[PDB]
């Protein structure tokens, strides 16, 4: 389609702009050959319990990109109230709140600034959300316990 070649042309620039400018602790590239399929990596913020661990993501670009938000989620297990066993992430930016002006580079940051501060009033994993609220020490400990065995 024409809306295909276009979406692609955009995707390309985004990638060229992550070379002329890599986001903080964030890295992303096409899974080779396929352009609408990227993997991302995150170095676990130093203001988080995930400090040290490397977390992999998969980015699947809609053919209607950037008019429709890119599907993205973790492959690496991670202890967080807004990320579940599947790998799903809870960002409005990635649902009804996505603007065509938004870019991958931007999204990764939005994700990092989430690993540092989670939103527990709208949680993907209630059990954890309650631990964050009630007993932080617990949370941080556990988050690291997972970052330890899963992300390293």
């Amino acid at each position: 389609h024409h809306m295909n070649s276009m979406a692609l042309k955009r995707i390309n620039k985004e990638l060229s702009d992550l070379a002329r400018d890599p986001p903080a602790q964030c890295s992303a590239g096409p899974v080779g050959d396929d352009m609408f399929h990227w993997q991302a990596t995150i170095m676990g913020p130093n203001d988080s319990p995930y400090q040290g661990g490397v977390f992999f993501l998969t980015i699947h670009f809609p053919t209607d990109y950037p008019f429709k938000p890119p599907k993205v989620a973790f492959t690496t297990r991670i202890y967080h109230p807004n990320i579940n066993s599947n790998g799903s992430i809870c960002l409005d930016i990635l649902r009804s709140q996505w603007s065509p002006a938004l870019t991958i580079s931007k999204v990764l940051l939005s994700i990092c600034s989430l690993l540092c501060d989670p939103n527990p009033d709208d949680p993907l994993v209630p059990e954890i959300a309650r631990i964050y609220k009630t007993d932080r020490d617990k949370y941080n400990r556990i988050s690291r316990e997972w970052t330890q065995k899963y992300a390293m």
Binding site: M6, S99, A101
Partner: protein, 78 residues
Amino acid sequence: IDYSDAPDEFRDPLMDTLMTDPVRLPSGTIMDRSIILRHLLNSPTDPFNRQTLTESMLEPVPELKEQIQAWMREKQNS
């Protein structure tokens, strides 16, 4: 053959294509009518300030168009 090479500016803010019918959103942002129109099918909002936006609110920008056309004409020699 042909290509661009286009001096930004002419280029669309979103897709970075060459424009063929520049319009200015209330935002003050200049977009190619074709691109912006496609956005308005999903959500009636400026893709930047996220304010409400309809076709009606799109004012054409001829000054730029001629600038582009003339440019395309110059890119027909040598």
